[PDB]
């Protein structure tokens, strides 16, 4: 019923995360992106979400991103410094 557009920064095509309501938390969006793409338990990478225009990061997992928004996704090495919190 609702959707958030995302694209990995090195990739050409854009994908969707489907959900219900006005928006998604940065936390749930990261969790869905990880599970939809089978990225793993989070010990091997970090996942960060960015604004395509301002290039600023969504650094607060409690922020609610409104429906129909687009974001850039970057999967980086693990340095908590990883992505395990979006899996447990």
């Amino acid at each position: 019923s609702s959707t958030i557009f995302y694209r990995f920064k090195s990739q050409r095509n854009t994908s969707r995360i489907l959900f219900d309501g006005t928006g998604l938390t940065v936390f749930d969006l990261k969790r869905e992106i990880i599970q939809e793409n089978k990225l793993g338990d989070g010990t091997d990478f970090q996942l960060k979400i960015y604004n395509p225009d301002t290039e600023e990061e969504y650094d607060d997992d409690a922020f609610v991103i409104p429906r129909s928004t687009s974001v850039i996704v970057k999967r980086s090495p693990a340095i908590k410094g990883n992505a395990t919190r979006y899996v447990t």
Partner: peptide, 16 residues
């Protein structure tokens, strides 16, 4: 040790 995108280098960190 991985499959899919999890097996890839961290391409998102550089403008290819």
């Amino acid at each position: 040790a991985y499959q899919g995108l999890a097996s890839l280098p961290f391409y998102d960190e550089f403008d290819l």
